[PDB]
Amino acid sequence: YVNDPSNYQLLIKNLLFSPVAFNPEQEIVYANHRRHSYKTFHDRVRQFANALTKMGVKKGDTVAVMDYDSHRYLECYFAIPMIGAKLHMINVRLSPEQILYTIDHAEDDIILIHEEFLPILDQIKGRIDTVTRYVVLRDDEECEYERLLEQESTEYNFPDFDENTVATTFYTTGTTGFPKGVFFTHRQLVLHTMGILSTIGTNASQGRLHQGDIYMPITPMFHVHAWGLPYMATMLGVKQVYPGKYVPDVLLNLIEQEKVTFSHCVPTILHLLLSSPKSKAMDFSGWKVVIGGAALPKALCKSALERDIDVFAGYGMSETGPILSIVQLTPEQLELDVDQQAEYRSKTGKKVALVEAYIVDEDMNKLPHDGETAGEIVVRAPWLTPNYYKDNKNSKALWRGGYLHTGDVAHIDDEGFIKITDRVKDMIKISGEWVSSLELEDILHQHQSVSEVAVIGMPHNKWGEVPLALVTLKEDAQVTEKELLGFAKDREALLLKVKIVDEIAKTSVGKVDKKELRKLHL
Amino acid sequence: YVNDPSNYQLLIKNLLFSPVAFNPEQEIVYANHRRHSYKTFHDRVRQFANALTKMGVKKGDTVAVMDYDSHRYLECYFAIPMIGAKLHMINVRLSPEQILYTIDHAEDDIILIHEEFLPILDQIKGRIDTVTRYVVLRDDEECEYERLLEQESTEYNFPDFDENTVATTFYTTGTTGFPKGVFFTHRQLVLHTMGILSTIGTNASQGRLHQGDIYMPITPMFHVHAWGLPYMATMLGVKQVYPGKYVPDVLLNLIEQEKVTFSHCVPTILHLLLSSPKSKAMDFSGWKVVIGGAALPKALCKSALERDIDVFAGYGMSETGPILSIVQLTPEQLELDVDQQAEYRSKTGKKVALVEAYIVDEDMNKLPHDGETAGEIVVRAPWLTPNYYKDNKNSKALWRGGYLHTGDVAHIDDEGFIKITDRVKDMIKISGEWVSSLELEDILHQHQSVSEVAVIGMPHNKWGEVPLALVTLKEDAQVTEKELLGFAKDREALLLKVKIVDEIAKTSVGKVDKKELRKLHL
Amino acid sequence: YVNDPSNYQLLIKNLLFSPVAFNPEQEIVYANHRRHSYKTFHDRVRQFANALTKMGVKKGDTVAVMDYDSHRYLECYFAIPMIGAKLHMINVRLSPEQILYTIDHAEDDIILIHEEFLPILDQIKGRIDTVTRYVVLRDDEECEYERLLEQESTEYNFPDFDENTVATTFYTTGTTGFPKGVFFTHRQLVLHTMGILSTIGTNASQGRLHQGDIYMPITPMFHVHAWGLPYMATMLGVKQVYPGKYVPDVLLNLIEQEKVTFSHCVPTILHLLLSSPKSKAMDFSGWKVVIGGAALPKALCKSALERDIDVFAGYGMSETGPILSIVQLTPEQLELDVDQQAEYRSKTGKKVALVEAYIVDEDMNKLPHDGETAGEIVVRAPWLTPNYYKDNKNSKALWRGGYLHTGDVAHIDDEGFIKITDRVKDMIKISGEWVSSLELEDILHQHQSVSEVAVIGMPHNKWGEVPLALVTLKEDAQVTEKELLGFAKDREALLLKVKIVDEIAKTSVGKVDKKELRKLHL
Numbered sequence A, B, C: 001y002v003n004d005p006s007n008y009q010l011l012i013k014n015l016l017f018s019p020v021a022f023n024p025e026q027e028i029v030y031a032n033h034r035r036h037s038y039k040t041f042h043d044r045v046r047q048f049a050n051a052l053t054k055m056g057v058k059k060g061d062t063v064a065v066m067d068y069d070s071h072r073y074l075e076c077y078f079a080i081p082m083i084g085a086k087l088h089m090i091n092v093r094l095s096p097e098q099i100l101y102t103i104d105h106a107e108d109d110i111i112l113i114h115e116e117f118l119p120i121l122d123q124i125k126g127r128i129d130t131v132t133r134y135v136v137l138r139d140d141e142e143c144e145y146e147r148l149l150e151q152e153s154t155e156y157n158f159p160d161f162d163e164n165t166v167a168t169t170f171y172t173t174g175t176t177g178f179p180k181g182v183f184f185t186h187r188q189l190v191l192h193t194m195g196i197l198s199t200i201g202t203n204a205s206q207g208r209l210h211q212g213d214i215y216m217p218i219t220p221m222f223h224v225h226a227w228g229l230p231y232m233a234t235m236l237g238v239k240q241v242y243p244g245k246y247v248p249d250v251l252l253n254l255i256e257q258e259k260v261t262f263s264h265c266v267p268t269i270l271h272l273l274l275s276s277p278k279s280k281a282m283d284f285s286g287w288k289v290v291i292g293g294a295a296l297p298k299a300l301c302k303s304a305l306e307r308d309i310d311v312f313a314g315y316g317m318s319e320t321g322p323i324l325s326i327v328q329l330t331p332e333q334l335e336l337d338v339d340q341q342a343e344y345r346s347k348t349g350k351k352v353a354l355v356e357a358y359i360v361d362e363d364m365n366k367l368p369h370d371g372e373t374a375g376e377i378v379v380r381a382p383w384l385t386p387n388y389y390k391d392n393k394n395s396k397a398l399w400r401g402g403y404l405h406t407g408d409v410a411h412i413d414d415e416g417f418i419k420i421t422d423r424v425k426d427m428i429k430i431s432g433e434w435v436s437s438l439e440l441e442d443i444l445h446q447h448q449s450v451s452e453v454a455v456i457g458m459p460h461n462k463w464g465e466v467p468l469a470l471v472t473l474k475e476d477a478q479v480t481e482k483e484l485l486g487f488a489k490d491r492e493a494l495l496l497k498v499k500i501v502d503e504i505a506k507t508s509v510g511k512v513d514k515k516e517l518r519k520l521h522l
């Protein structure tokens, strides 16, 4: 087969071999374990490509990875798609049965697994069918990955192919069902990297990623491509530090010792870092954390700002690149005091380059951006999944009306800021209105004796759903007093019914399992 | 969206609206039930398109059909792909559990079902999830299909789209596993129609389909697109007769009364037609039957030829268009007596236009075409399925080495004739050689007291498999005598071990279930 | 670059290596010069590919050919596109200045020229810039083509590429302007071959091309791909005879000696063949000539039919494949006497498979097919050129309204027969009506003393054009008598003005130059 050289294909190999800046002596660091350079990283990628080719991996095969944040994961990220194979990212926090389901669904050919998840694989080994090889990863010289890499040469000619070939795949958390498989191509990943770099690098003076930064991930990195940050960092040729296990002390040592300036985490990990005693005598005025898990609270943002940390929220939903929104503050808003700055930073943010992001009601009428009217977000972007893997009913509901349906209810204002209120499946329909469960669950959580609250909604057969607030307490506070306090705030008349429960069911990842609560409590 | 008009897309709507010949007053006949014209057929197709659009069917939806050969099936064949939807063909001869599996796997949106398969649907109705509507078809005016057609107008503007959009899908019989989903696009179907028309219409004087023929199908028509014949006939604008139930008497009346000249069936139906008493006083010297089920025997071919019937074999395997080979006789071979003509007609035939069809061993070395060396057939054609639906392990084994693996062992000769010997999974490996089970099962079936024979193969742990001949008899013939007769023919020394069984297990369609025999008998 | 094997590309190499029928011992014959077999033809094609690769020809280079009908031209037809280069066909009947213009416009890299056109090249050699090599072709062993072929081996691996790569190009005759460059791709040529084979091979009993025919071209073969016949014949594996110079005696010897059954020519050559004395004692009842030049007259058709020749007209216009219409007679019309059969055969014919062919007025309103209303023909087909080479103004006028504008006025009837009346640029607009010049020029040509007549049209500044009939006579017949005879036939009142001229200007090919007549006579 002969192709004309003029036709250019967007490939990940161009992301690695044609960076914005390449520094041969820049360091890739795996926490207290392994330091090497970029000129060693490229040779390592070529060696891994040779080893994969020797192993029988081809243009259609699937390699699954199950480990922590390390140099090996970045090497996989770059080497497996370049061969033409597909990289399946396994969520290690799922239950072993869910992991078995995802492995059978994806039909992986090779499995690279750390030596820490071996007991999990022991339970799920008899019932796995398609895997011809397991490669055990270790933090010492006894690693099979290192043994397989050290036999091959550092020379490899990476092929080019169509830019629409699938590169990566992973599964959703599954709070509402079984996990859903989402996949992306080489083109989509390259475009996402360039679009996000154009959006966040061109900011005037706040929340920008540039070639002088030092990057350390704090998100799982096996979920949403670690927000695409490991790709972007590799394009900038910046120093990269990989922590591994996420122990707050080792993280607060890696920051400081390595002078990390850019990272991204979730509100729980940020709270753990800020509350650790070792952080009380630590300098934080070089750190730019990006919070993208869910619903950055105002108090956490204010405390982080008072610690002189550049904190801003981002919004992505695991099948949209993932990045769709990033908080960017103009220099006029950089004067505002800590309260107003926290208010602006806590929002989901404005849409990134090449994104439509309309707000819509049902039937698709494109509600106005007045700042209080709420509706589902429908988006168009170069890096959206076209459907779900081996699913057609949910794929059909995903792209209804020619737009991707996120399933999140939000209100946009005149300035373009987006504020998510709830999920579509979690809204409470009283008569014809959609009542967000999050707002009144926060109202009830403002009580001193309330530990946690979940609102679901119970059928009335007269007007519709009626909110049901399942509350777990720490002290003795009475059921009637919750209703009295709720009447004292928020109009719900007498429709707020509160039930005291011993525990509130969670999911495997850690989110609240509302479907399980509906199963137990009507 | 704007497309340039110069770019031409191969679509089925071009197959219908730009035929080789269009005759407005040509007849479409449904046996003793409904006669109409082509000028009524086009209006009917447009009415069905309007009804489907009114029903909510869109460019990605799936419509399943479960009925006999009729005008309605042709209307579905043409109207469902033109809308952009996908036509799922349901094999009604499968067991209801297998039908449920295929329905769940395909995720059909609408189901059109005859009133005869309603009891089957009753068993499989609770466990079906994706179907929003069932349309019951009837042979009287009470048909819901006719009621839905008569409400709409005969005007419709059929959209154009990409020629790689999937048009049809169906599942394999499943003699070796569970059924496998295969799909084809608009381009592939159009190319298959044109290629087969070029191959069979240009024959000099034997076995040709031309614009003066009358076409009646005798194959299921819900399996392999009825060999693509209903499309091809519609391109030629020839008279089409649809029998329905396949009763030999009604078939032998439709031939004669309608003067059918071209058809296609399987050896069992042909034997039933030839053995019917009503055929003893019937003229057959205008009929050209195409036999494509499996292994046209020489005796049947000779008797059909003595009845002055133009009989020739065709080879296709349900995921290759299906047509790959057609027997075509040069005018020199038209002189040969009935025995030599039967020998030439019983073969699978030469490859059709735009087909490679190499013979190969294992490891892919492309064995010579000497006429006795046997190997697997590997093909390349414009109309091959790229993979299996929602399957990746079997898809990977399907296209190994860059060629489609049929799984049939055959030998090709210098003239180009192909003769299938067995299936790959049915070959017996004694020491290093592949022994076809079909040849020695025929040898054993030549016995007078043998009713049927199946050869599978039993492990020896010394050289390999050892053939095991499970034989069902009609009379008293002894186990030792089978071995003695086998030694008298065919070198197998003493390796032919014969076991007498009461019955031989079959599959749902009617083929011999060799996997079940291996499960019962070791 | 790696491509998946499932994706199939329509290429000419598949036309050669995957035919409908391949016969190794079938003969390719070059009249009284060279006989070889197909097994020699394939080796010759591979040798030519090796020689072209050795010469520096690449995937974008251009090779021009300037010779007669021979085996070498077929070898070029097949070998040059297979390499990926572009085959430029040079019309040797154009004036040397026009040939220079076309050569400079196309920018040919290599030129293969016969030893007969060498004096023409001598005049046009200084002013040619892009040609790095001339290869002189001869009918003896001193041919440079044979010398270049005999040095290479008969083994070559032909590459595959995109099916939209340009394969052939040539220029129009230029009766209305300068020649216009038209080009076609591999896909278009393959589709044209298959579509025409499906259309003409499936005819019941008249005018069909099958695998038992013997093919000899009588059209230039450097113009419109010789109607695509050399490709189609090669797909059928039929015997091919190439005459060379078109001497009527050698043609009438090649027919008879080689038993040619299928050919195609123009009315002038057919008249010369029928009027030759050697044809008076010749048997013609196996010959099927296809007449596609222009306007097959009824008298010629009747005389050819009385000679027991199967004659039918075809319509194509050098940028539409070219074939768009072929006359096909149903078996009911095969009973009709010679007069009615000649009437039916003289028409342009019905459209071939996959062709729309609407009749339209100006502004595009799609006039009815009543049989007498005339309008321009607008067509859609898989094998139409998308634009003109290096032209954008005429390309824009070519595809106005989303349909290709042929520029011919015709009327279609209820049965689908098309009858061209004139060209759009040749119609005479009296007040608001379009008067065909051909009809009244035939009326005037019915006079005994008229040798030839051309009607152009002279401005009146009152209602519009007024026909002007320039007539060249053989005898003394008077100007007034032409008008009197014209009034005796045909309503033109007194608007038919006739002028006697000594000679009527023709074009380089031989058609009447109406633009030159407008330049000389107002």
Ligand SMILES: Nc1ncnc2c1ncn2[C@@H]1O[C@H](COP(=O)(O)OP(=O)(O)NP(=O)(O)O)[C@@H](O)[C@H]1O
Residues within 6 Å of the ligand: A172, A173, A174, A175, A176, A177, A178, A179, A180, A291, A292, A293, A294, A295, A296, A313, A314, A315, A316, A317, A318, A319, A348, A406, A408, A420, A423
């Ligand atoms: N910045 C944010 N603010 C508020 N909510 C957010 C933010 N980022 C993400 N979310 C929510 O978290 C979700 C992340 O999606 P995902 O990672 O697939 O988990 P999931 O939706 O629970 N998986 P599934 O149960 O299959 O839908 C989004 O759909 C939002 O509902």
Ligand SMILES: Nc1ncnc2c1ncn2[C@@H]1O[C@H](COP(=O)(O)OP(=O)(O)NP(=O)(O)O)[C@@H](O)[C@H]1O
Residues within 6 Å of the ligand: B172, B173, B174, B175, B176, B177, B178, B179, B180, B291, B292, B293, B294, B295, B296, B313, B314, B315, B316, B317, B318, B319, B348, B406, B408, B420, B423
């Ligand atoms: N002319 C023929 N001569 C001999 N065998 C044939 C012929 N035509 C078809 N066959 C056989 O019949 C098969 C038809 O394939 P198909 O309709 O999918 O049934 P199947 O193979 O049993 N389905 P599956 O069990 O999933 O492979 C071919 O694969 C051949 O093995």
Ligand SMILES: Nc1ncnc2c1ncn2[C@@H]1O[C@H](COP(=O)(O)OP(=O)(O)NP(=O)(O)O)[C@@H](O)[C@H]1O
Residues within 6 Å of the ligand: C172, C173, C174, C175, C176, C177, C178, C179, C180, C291, C292, C293, C294, C295, C296, C313, C314, C315, C316, C317, C318, C319, C348, C406, C408, C420, C423
């Ligand atoms: N069967 C036919 N009957 C009548 N006229 C025909 C027939 N076939 C071709 N023609 C005419 O001949 C033309 C052939 O086109 P072509 O070979 O390009 O010559 P041309 O039109 O003179 N070149 P150009 O001057 O650039 O348009 C058609 O456009 C018709 O006008």
Ligand SMILES: [Mg+2]
Residues within 6 Å of the ligand: A172, A317, A407
């Ligand atoms: Mg989600």
Ligand SMILES: [Mg+2]
Residues within 6 Å of the ligand: B172, B317, B407
């Ligand atoms: Mg099969």
Ligand SMILES: [Mg+2]
Residues within 6 Å of the ligand: C172, C317, C407
């Ligand atoms: Mg023209």
